[PDB]
Amino acid sequence: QSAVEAIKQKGKLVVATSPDYAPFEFQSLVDGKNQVVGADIDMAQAIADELGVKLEILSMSFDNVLTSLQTGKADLAVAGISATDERKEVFDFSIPYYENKISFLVHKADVEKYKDLTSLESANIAAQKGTVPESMVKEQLPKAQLTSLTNMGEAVNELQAGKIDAVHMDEPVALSYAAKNAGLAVATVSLKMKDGDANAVALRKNSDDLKEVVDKVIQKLKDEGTYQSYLEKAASLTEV
Ligand SMILES: NC(=[NH2+])NCCC[C@H](N)C(=O)O
Ligand SMILES: [Cl-]
């Protein structure tokens, strides 16, 4: 019943994430290779340090992140998770740690084309299974051809192969792909987005002791400009 005590006793904070989402979380060559890195990971490390424990990153696909939290495979879920009303029926969320827009990644040659909703409606769109960007397309563009894919890298791969024309994703991720790759760009078209649905850490309900610690760390990071600095550090790093 006491999250903070259980965490101290097992000597680790277990954080479920989906590392297909630079600059939030992704894989990098770090003193060797195969390391999960990113702004969410730095923030999780800050939470583990506050609790005086080791950080364990449990990687999985995004549509299983909240499921694993719900069933006790993780203490927290940190994966650029939008704090929605519907999600708040099942989970508690920390205060927001970062707020951003949702945009489309397209080929550079198509940037002049994909400027409105009308252009997307006949295009082949992809979004990640179990995400807010996926729901927005389903809800606002129900006659667009939507392919839902488990892994975000796989969606961008289909974009590059030309099977997909546009990929809906959090803007910092689209900006990262566009910056790291010559023939990709962020489109100007955007769908209607919900106010205050920002990124937050998810917890199981009645985890108030642990929520307080997570909130304290997040507040300090926001007050020091540190989450923003984490994202900029991440954008310097090389994906794998
Ligand atoms: N690591 C990831 N793939 N994260 C996807 C997050 C997508 C969106 N922000 C959501 O909460 O549904
Ligand atoms: Cl761009």
* CA-wise closest residue to 176 among 207, 153, 205, 196: 153
Rounded to the nearest 5°, which phi and psi values hold at 223?
A: -70, -30
Resolution (A): 1.9
Per the CB < 8 A criterion, the answer to whether 66 and 202 are in contact is yes
**Ligand approaching nearest to the C-alpha of 21:** 1
Sheet with 166-170: strands ordered across: 145-149, 124-128, 166-170, 102-107, 184-186
Per the CB < 8 A criterion, the answer to whether 63 and 129 are in contact is yes
Contacts with 79 (C-beta within 8 Å, 6 or more apart), sequence order: 16, 17, 18, 21, 24, 25, 40, 62, 65
Unique residue bearing structure tokens 């990644």: 105
- Identify the three-state secondary structure at position 27: strand
- Chain center to CA of 195: 17
Identify the sign of the CA torsion 197, 201, 206, 212: negative
**Ligand approaching nearest to the C-alpha of 100:** 1
CA dihedral 94, 198, 48, 204 (to 10 degrees): 40
Identify the sign of the CA torsion 187, 65, 164, 142: negative
The DSSP H or E segment spanning 13 is strand 12-17
Q: Ligand 1 pocket by C-beta < 6 Å: which residues?
A: 18, 20-21, 24-25, 62, 79-82, 128, 131-133, 152, 170
Per the CB < 8 A criterion, the answer to whether 28 and 19 are in contact is no
User: Which tokens in the block code for residue 145?
Assistant: 């051809």
Residue 102 CA, closest ligand 1 atom number: 9
Which domains occur in the chain, in start order?
Answer: 1-100+196-240 (3.40.190.10), 101-195 (3.40.190.10)
Show the 3-state SS of 201-220: CEEECCCHHHHHHHHHHHHH
